């Protein structure tokens, strides 16, 4: 019952490649990612207003 005592927290958000390229140093392994399999239609857990 205390948010401070929590060990972890997980959030899922929508992002595009330009956002990741804004800070090229911070992110790695961008070329291996595939964009078709990870999509809002393919992931049912994510809830969003995007068509």
């Amino acid at each position: 019952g205390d948010i401070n005592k929590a060990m972890f927290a997980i959030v899922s958000f929508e992002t595009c490649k330009a956002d990741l390229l804004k800070e090229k140093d911070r992110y790695h392994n961008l070329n291996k990612i595939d964009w078709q399999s990870s999509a809002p239609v393919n992931e049912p857990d994510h809830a969003t207003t995007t068509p």
Partner: peptide
């Protein structure tokens, strides 16, 4: 009455491979 989960099991859209190849010439 029953407790529907309200998730709507749906099937996604099948891929297309020939169409991106083709260039389009306007009429």
């Amino acid at each position: 009455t029953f407790f529907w989960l309200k998730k709507a099991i749906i099937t996604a859209r099948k891929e297309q491979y020939f169409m991106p190849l083709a260039s389009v010439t306007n009429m």
